[PDB]
Design a protein around this ligand. Sequence first.
Ligand code: CL
Ligand code: CL
Lengths: 212, 208
Amino acid sequence: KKGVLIAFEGIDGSGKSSQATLLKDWIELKRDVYLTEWNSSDWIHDIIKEAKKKDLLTPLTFSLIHATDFSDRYERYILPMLKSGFIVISDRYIYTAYARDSVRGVDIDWVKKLYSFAIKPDITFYIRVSPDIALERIKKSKRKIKPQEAGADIFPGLSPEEGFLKYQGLITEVYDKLVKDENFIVIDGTKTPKEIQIQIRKFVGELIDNSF
Amino acid sequence: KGVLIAFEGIDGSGKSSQATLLKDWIELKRDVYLTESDWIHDIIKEAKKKDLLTPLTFSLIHATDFSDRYERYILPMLKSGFIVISDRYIYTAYARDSVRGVDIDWVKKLYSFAIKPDITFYIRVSPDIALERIKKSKRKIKPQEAGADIFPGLSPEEGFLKYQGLITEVYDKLVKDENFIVIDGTKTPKEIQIQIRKFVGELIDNSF
Ligand SMILES: [Cl-]
Ligand SMILES: [Cl-]
């Protein structure tokens, strides 16, 4: 009957992506649902970054490019679907921008005001896990750490492993500082994917049943 | 010792001409920089193919462009002791965005990373005279100058009168709070520039 916005926040390797997908799989059995990812930038993002590919951009300009691109995604896809009664699940939401931008020196209060045009999630799940554990999982999966996951732009002198630990650690600190103000539902990401999802569904089930 | 001088006014007010003329003159005395974006037009063009471009996104596109030029050119130059002149500063955005429905207070917060000019000249003139000039010179009114997105269907000329009128209302309400130096744009280019040079000189000739 009413649209609902569910957000997932967590570091790379925390498993929040899997949890968002698992929740979509369950919700779609009964209701219309749309799953998106913060990382899924659109056309404005591409036009500006390509146009300025030869120039060195500042954290502030990147913050604005991302907000600009999101403002379009928001009005074009997200908000319309919510108004239509869709349940929207976002694998990483505006809080990821809060973290990525503030860790790079952009004023936190300014970034919050910048994104004030966007509605807050009905529920935000923070899949919390130590960067050390997240790293172990990535190592065991045999895949390599991406420069972005290692915050290579900030820590080019560190190995991908050390960069990951330092950078994801800073992202974790931002999320931790946002928990109380943003009413994050903190989930112990060290638990099994199944136990985590069960907890999530209990929270979401209660939410939807009381949604009318 | 860096001084930021901004020029504001409607299209056809001569703000751009006055800004450049001032730069050419200050260049004879001190280090000075005149602020001078393709991709924006490419976004608007692509947006038309996508049937949507909200005032909010439009506001952010320009703020993004401004942030780049501010942090890579304006701010560094001011820190190099340069006098920086801009024919378009944050107030241009205040008007452009607020007439399209964007909360001006949010726009003020958006651009709060930028310092306020040491001097802001507001070349004020009625849209009627600005238009009369524009078409006294054989120039064509472009879509942006006519507020085509706000007043679609109107001839560029008719849209110009209405759009620039709305823009003027915003500049007028910023005068007191932003300490705008209001100039009668009906004066000749020479009269205006000579008065501007005398004013700026009285301020920087005894500091340099
Ligand atoms: Cl992360
Ligand atoms: Cl990240």
